[PDB]
Amino acid sequence: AYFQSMSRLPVIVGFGGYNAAGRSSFHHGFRRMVIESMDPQARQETLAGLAVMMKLVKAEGGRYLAEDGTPLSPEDIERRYAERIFASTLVRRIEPQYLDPDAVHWHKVLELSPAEGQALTFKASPKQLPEPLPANWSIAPAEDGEVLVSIHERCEFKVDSYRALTVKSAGQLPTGFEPGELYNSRFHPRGLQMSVVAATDAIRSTGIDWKTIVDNVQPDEIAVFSGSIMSQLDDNGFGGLMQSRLKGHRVSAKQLPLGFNSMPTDFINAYVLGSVGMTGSITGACATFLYNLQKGIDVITSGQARVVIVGNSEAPILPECIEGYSAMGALATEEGLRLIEGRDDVDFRRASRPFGENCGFTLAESSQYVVLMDDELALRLGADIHGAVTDVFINADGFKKSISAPGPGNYLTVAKAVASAVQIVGLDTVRHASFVHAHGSSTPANRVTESEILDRVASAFGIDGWPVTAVKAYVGHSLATASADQLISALGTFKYGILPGIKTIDKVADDVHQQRLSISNRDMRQDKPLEVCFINSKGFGGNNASGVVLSPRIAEKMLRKRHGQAAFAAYVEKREQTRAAARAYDQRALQGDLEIIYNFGQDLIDEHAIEVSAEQVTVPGFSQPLVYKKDARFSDMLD
Amino acid sequence: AYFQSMSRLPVIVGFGGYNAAGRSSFHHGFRRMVIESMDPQARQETLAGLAVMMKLVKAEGGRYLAEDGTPLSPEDIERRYAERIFASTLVRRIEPQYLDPDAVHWHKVLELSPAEGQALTFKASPKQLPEPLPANWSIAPAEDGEVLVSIHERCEFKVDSYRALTVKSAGQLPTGFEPGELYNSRFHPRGLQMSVVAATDAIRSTGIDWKTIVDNVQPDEIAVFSGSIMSQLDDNGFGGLMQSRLKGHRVSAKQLPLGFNSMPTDFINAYVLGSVGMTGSITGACATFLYNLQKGIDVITSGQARVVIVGNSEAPILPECIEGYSAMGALATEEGLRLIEGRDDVDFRRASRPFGENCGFTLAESSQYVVLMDDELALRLGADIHGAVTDVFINADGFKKSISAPGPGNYLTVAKAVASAVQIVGLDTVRHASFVHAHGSSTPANRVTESEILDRVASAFGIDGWPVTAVKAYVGHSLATASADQLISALGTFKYGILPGIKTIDKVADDVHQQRLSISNRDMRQDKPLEVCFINSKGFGGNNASGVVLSPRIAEKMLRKRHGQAAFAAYVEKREQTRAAARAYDQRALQGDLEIIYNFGQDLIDEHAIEVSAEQVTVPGFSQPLVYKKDARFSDMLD
Ligand SMILES: [Cl-]
Ligand SMILES: [Cl-]
Incomplete structure (x- = not known):
């Protein structure tokens, strides 16, 4: 490090x-x-x-x-x-x-x-x-x-x-x-x-x-x-x-x-x-x-x-x-x-x-x-x-009383997530083209404590009208899978340019901290496309996390910059074919033709045909040998 | 990467x-x-x-x-x-x-x-x-x-x-x-x-x-x-x-x-x-x-x-x-x-x-x-x-029938672990000063399948008489904690130069693969101190892992090489004091004076006193500010 x-x-x-x-x-x-x-x-x-x-x-x-x-x-x-x-x-x-x-x-x-x-x-x-x-x-x-x-x-x-x-x-x-x-x-x-x-x-x-x-x-x-x-x-x-x-x-x-x-x-x-x-x-x-x-x-x-x-x-x-x-x-x-x-x-x-x-x-x-x-x-x-995912930050709450009560770790995860995004896309893009997938669990404690965190991070980074959406309004709280429901919804906002409203509420509760947040009960379409999503999550036990997701547009700019126009053009050609294959799957899925993969008892590796040497392992069924990776981590500590 | x-x-x-x-x-x-x-x-x-x-x-x-x-x-x-x-x-x-x-x-x-x-x-x-x-x-x-x-x-x-x-x-x-x-x-x-x-x-x-x-x-x-x-x-x-x-x-x-x-x-x-x-x-x-x-x-x-x-x-x-x-x-x-x-x-x-x-x-x-x-x-x-820990390798089994039956992933984890150790300590030290903390779960399937893996990796790396020990003979199988029981026992071998025998057996079963392994029912003291331990583990669900642990002697050589003799000497002086403090704890523990830490409801962070800026977060009770880390991962993809 x-x-x-x-x-x-x-x-x-x-x-x-x-x-x-x-x-x-x-x-x-x-x-x-x-x-x-x-x-x-x-x-x-x-x-x-x-x-x-x-x-x-x-x-x-x-x-x-x-x-x-x-x-x-x-x-x-x-x-x-x-x-x-x-x-x-x-x-x-x-x-x-x-x-x-x-x-x-x-x-x-x-x-x-x-x-x-x-x-x-x-x-x-x-x-x-x-x-x-x-x-x-x-x-x-x-x-x-x-x-x-x-x-x-x-x-x-x-x-x-x-x-x-x-x-x-x-x-x-x-x-x-x-x-x-x-x-x-x-x-x-x-x-x-x-x-x-x-x-x-x-x-x-x-x-x-x-x-x-x-x-x-x-x-x-x-x-x-x-x-x-x-x-x-x-x-x-x-x-x-x-x-x-x-x-x-x-x-x-x-x-x-x-x-x-x-x-x-x-x-x-x-x-x-x-x-x-x-x-x-x-x-x-x-x-x-x-x-x-x-x-x-x-x-x-x-x-x-x-x-x-x-x-x-x-x-x-x-x-x-x-x-x-x-x-x-x-x-x-x-x-x-x-x-x-x-x-x-x-x-x-x-x-x-x-x-x-x-x-x-x-x-x-x-x-x-x-x-x-x-x-x-x-x-x-x-x-x-x-999309692309650049960071997830995780921070506990320090000393607690009740193990399930909310705590301060989520201040740290949200702040670090926003700072990390600023380094990658710049302050302007964070201020005017980012949104938050709020944890939004539908509790009196969460609506106050989470809005206070988002509001205070917004203030620190000079964000106003920070758009907030809450997927749990639609699909409830799926526990382990909760922040995956958030991430996948975020990808839809990138695709279609729509920020889902919190349609189940008539207005935001009086105790929610809103000065720098835009929390709506209606779907919203931003004039300037949203480019970055902060996924926010927490749970019992002093567990907090925030993730940074970049749009396809941002990710493509990054790949173009790193790899150059010739390599990117070759990629675009291959991608037309992979997009056609994906669309064909979607069409079958629409028809109920899902062809679930469940390969129980088939294509098992014959362990006696695994080949081990001092340079590599060959595994039956895999065309590529597993070549041991050269290590440079501690080279200065040796000899 | x-x-x-x-x-x-x-x-x-x-x-x-x-x-x-x-x-x-x-x-x-x-x-x-x-x-x-x-x-x-x-x-x-x-x-x-x-x-x-x-x-x-x-x-x-x-x-x-x-x-x-x-x-x-x-x-x-x-x-x-x-x-x-x-x-x-x-x-x-x-x-x-x-x-x-x-x-x-x-x-x-x-x-x-x-x-x-x-x-x-x-x-x-x-x-x-x-x-x-x-x-x-x-x-x-x-x-x-x-x-x-x-x-x-x-x-x-x-x-x-x-x-x-x-x-x-x-x-x-x-x-x-x-x-x-x-x-x-x-x-x-x-x-x-x-x-x-x-x-x-x-x-x-x-x-x-x-x-x-x-x-x-x-x-x-x-x-x-x-x-x-x-x-x-x-x-x-x-x-x-x-x-x-x-x-x-x-x-x-x-x-x-x-x-x-x-x-x-x-x-x-x-x-x-x-x-x-x-x-x-x-x-x-x-x-x-x-x-x-x-x-x-x-x-x-x-x-x-x-x-x-x-x-x-x-x-x-x-x-x-x-x-x-x-x-x-x-x-x-x-x-x-x-x-x-x-x-x-x-x-x-x-x-x-x-x-x-x-x-x-x-x-x-x-x-x-x-x-x-x-x-x-x-x-x-x-x-x-x-000791020092340099790597853990984890590999699944590929396609399976029964989810709990053994599989080929452990070939990969052991092979990669040994190769990684060769890069750090050299072939001679692996061949003549390493030992294996075998998974050694006491089953007919394990004794055959695990010994075959160890024997075949030994052959690949030119190891003979590879010493094997099995902590589960003493303390059984503690499930999640099993490989921690292994690691901690390994540290004892480094300390005292004794390899624990498998004292519960009268001899190794006839179907165990032993050509390149030394599996004893007696404690053994190696003339040449053991410097490296491979911790081997597996479980249901196609879960396999092998870890590499280096002795204090090896780790000290490495710190001396990286940091130099003046810095190491200053460290040695401070360490005399920390060793004295540790010994004093051991003495109290021997007397039953364990002073368990359980700080329920005490020293809770006042969340309203957390300070967030665009440069750092100050957390109540922590002397050091949390300064956001400069990122160089994707710098070539930007501008
Ligand atoms: Cl809420
Ligand atoms: Cl066994």
Whole structure:
């Protein structure tokens, strides 16, 4: 260290995934969020794609069929289905495919006592009786292998019972879209299904054959960083691990391994990419994706990896997660929303109200990935550029009281992020062509503390009217994946020049600090295109992060400057072909033809054919040898 | 990228923690593992310290008292207590303070049916009855607020029952040592208690006031990387989250946040160090510590951080974890060991038999930390050097079938690790003064697959008689913390020149690949001091890592070469004082005076006093301003 020398620039060459707004690739999810602001062709295309995903129309030979068989144009689909599509996307009341928020199962303790008046007696299979038999219970032989049991003392049974959750809303994938139906997903937790399906969307969005990418780098130069913050807590993962015996049965052979928080990452190496490269799963509570992204940037700038898949997968819409967050007072409850609305019949579509009158966050599911390459490899392959990522800063809070309360670290991350952007694009561009993807979690603490940080950093850097957007208004809070939802939305702003409004609020709460911020409940189109986005995130445990994302225009200027006009022109030619391939994928995806990659048990490396020498390793299936890298770090310390 | 320029060297300036061998700092745990090979003063000192930890003797005014009050010398302690100390440390049968492995609670499903012969009737409190009331049940009023219930149809109750686990053994902290008693640990999961207590041991082992360290760096230049792979699954964490309602009660306000796998890290920032610096928790299954260590090395070499606390905390000795791993066939069972021994009364102290006849790993608890500094800061502060860490390589397995089966990535990590060491210390030193801390998990698959990798890398680099040691023989497999147990043991080999034997095996299994390896069941002392250790690790999910650790001698030669004789002499003088301070801590720790740091609710930063400008941030409580770092990475892409 001291300072970093000239380095590879991380460019975003693909992105994809799924959240409550739909499919992320090609900006479809973004378009759903700003659907009314899009032109009709873009809107109708996205609506048609949602209709297919949701099984509202049948994709038949490039056309669309109603339940009647009636052929529909995209214009007809908007007329006929827009209301249903809108009602069955974004934050909304929790639907039965997850749970019934008025009837979740638990066990009550039922204390049964006998007394002088009536016997407490039953017949039972002896194999179902407690072991050892409770000493006070009577047992006698009965017919058909059963025994006659009588109880003489108070004891505790557990009985099935049903209760209502105080929280009724969540950010849910579009109703009817089922990731598990898209590949051989038997026994996989929902978070793993979502990771597999999202990863394929991201990889195919590049318009480049994965084989071509692998053939162009060393085997160790591919990296994947993903994971969840909860672990996979459904029945097929740690839910089964922790609950099976309390429900009367054994733990399965797969519940423990498939529950690990690294499995969204591990499944991508094992079944999607077939990578022998770098891997890891980094958590930082609700800033987790930016923690993974920091690692991704660092491995590119240090030269360790040239292709990086960075993302997360979280599927936390489960009664235990909801109760766990509720127990902290963290979530928007029905009663909380009743107070804000001043009526009993709440609009759960407005449960998430960043910077407005609000009362806690809304839990959501999402899996999102970006594909990064170094600039030189992107240039070589004709990879498209959706943006560039230059830094992520992470700072804890110092000493704390409550571990989950907000703290000062986010001052440091935002300040450092802005300063870093000034060095790269200049003060004027930061002042007049940057925006903030606010953490915007929809809590009274966040709206005050986050706005105060942004306002004070704005003042320090001489920014006024700093545009702020809050993706959680649309898709809720997907925990690990939250800042990936932010990043991907940001890319849509670069594409279409629209800053999504916070449409769920009627006005900004009176206690929000606004002097230097522009927070709107309407979509906005800036005269001067936005060139830089600051992604802001935080979580429990003194976790804070801010990321810097540059637009395609800025990134292209940078590649042109470094590589020159001849090399850039050659890149442009190759990129016309990769753009055509990507568009063809988007067209298939619109039709529901997603071709999920799940390569279980295929193309396994024969380890006995790995060749190791003192100069390199040859790995079966990889055309490029892994040549050990010459080290200059400590050369002055030697001899 | 392309290649890294001259860089800061990560040096190990402190280390500490707790596992089945005892306190890690000052090599006490190491000494327990090679206790019979130590000289009597070192052995008796460690035994006395264990005796105090285990409450077998009372530390009274620098002396030691038996239950009788009889004063004891360390020589007397060895005579009187060695047998008990040995029996109550290391891998052994699971003790009651964890669970009874012949009587773990669960619920059986008890199907109660009535028939023509006897009524099924009981009185109950109506508040304990299912909601809604099962439609077929009869209810009538009764005395004292209770109701009379009768059942007419088969239904399912859950009843308490007790079962035996097939696994009876684990690596357990020394019997009598209780981390929770050492600080205000109310409502903390065991893994968090262990993290807090281990972190203090590591920090105090440096012999430098934490304040002095903080005063010498910028606020963002401190980093902490830790975590667990399971999450905290005990009652106070995700166990309570996932089980409360199945046991009849509500989830608490703390079970969810304190269960997160990042909390071992978050607690250190919040309550131990008061850091506003970098943070993160990286998982890679049973290679996790090396994944955290890779991040630690990278932040030092890139200049992002100057002081890094790297470690892990795992406390997985819980019925659900044991059953979950057993369900995979991963653990050594009593029946498995009976087959190896050919008798029914198994020696559970030999449950873990790396490279011998064996039958699965042994689950263990451990929390371990190392304190890293860049070489320049270490020089400035007179920090001691226990070793240096130059690289960690991580490689996945490519396409897989079973996600938990072994794969080829570890070929790549070991090969790259060895090549990297050759560049730094030369081929001769690698060939004749290096050793391997084998993953050595005690499974039939591992003993073959790992030995084949090591043998084939040895052949490639012309190594013969490559010494191999396996720490899991002593302390079992602590999951996230496993490779920290390895690293810390390695430091002991550097200190004392002893390579611990695999004492639990009688000979190496016939299928182990040994041509170029030296695997012994006895402690060994090499004529030529060992200078380099390769730490090898792997886990489920296609996770593999290998780390390179250099001895103090090598690291000192390197610092002398870079910084020169005058600067090194000044360092030596300061280091005499820091060594004296560290020794004084070790003396207090021997007496049970550990002074655990837990600074809840104290010294909180007043966020309104944070000052942000376009040049720097001033943070209350930190003498050094955070000055934004000048970036040269992309300068050629600008203007
Ligand atoms: Cl908010
Ligand atoms: Cl083994």
